[PDB]
Design a protein around this ligand. Structure first.
Ligand SMILES: N[C@@H](CCS)C(=O)O
Ligand SMILES: [Fe+3]
Length: 186
């Protein structure tokens, strides 16, 4: 039974219940993520920015089946075009706006990757992607406002592929944590 998370801590407790089994009800998880009203005081500890690129800040290591982190995007910071390593990926906005651009999986033939669509993800909204849906790029295109997003991945993964927009060629990237549980992890 899905109740509104009152705080980030409450959300985390609810997620441990939603991931107590072996499968994932995506619509339920997205609904409860969207229902949490971002409260900056609750997540300030994890919102550690870097001047030059976006940072990944682990919030909860989950129960073996998921993990929850906060990404901090300076003005103009964005990602590669990337996949999600056969995992579920949820993205909720905590502050600001992000542009999400969708791409199809490339064919083996070298070719420009043409965007299939784009949208602006706004404060408190929760987006979802998986590899069956496609690839995406996420960017803070603002010149004046940093963005903060809450990401849930299930199962957890620490590698993915970046895709070259000119060719569709991919390269494996290992993702690192800027911090864990509020502690900077150089
Ligand atoms: N998957 C990316 C962010 C957009 S989902 C990452 O964890 O670095
Ligand atoms: Fe992503």
């Amino acid at each position: 039974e899905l109740l509104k998370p009152r705080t980030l801590a409450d959300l985390i407790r609810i997620l441990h219940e939603l991931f107590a089994g072996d499968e994932v009800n995506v619509e339920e998880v997205q609904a409860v993520l969207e229902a949490y009203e971002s409260n900056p005081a609750e997540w300030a500890l994890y919102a550690k920015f870097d001047q030059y690129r976006y940072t990944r800040n682990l919030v909860d290591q989950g129960n073996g089946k998921f993990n929850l982190m906060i990404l901090c995007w300076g003005e103009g910071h964005g990602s590669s075009i990337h996949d999600h390593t056969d995992s579920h990926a949820f993205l909720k906005l905590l502050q600001g706006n992000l542009k999400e651009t969708l791409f199809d999986w490339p064919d083996k033939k070298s070719n420009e990757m043409i965007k299939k669509s784009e949208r602006t993800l706004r404060e408190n909204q929760c987006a979802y992607i998986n590899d069956s849906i496609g690839l995406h790029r996420v960017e803070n295109v603002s010149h004046t406002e940093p963005a903060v997003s809450l990401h849930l991945y299930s199962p957890p993964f620490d590698t993915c592929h970046a895709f070259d927009q000119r060719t569709g060629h991919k390269n494996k990237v290992t993702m690192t944590f800027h911090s864990k549980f509020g502690i900077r992890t150089p």
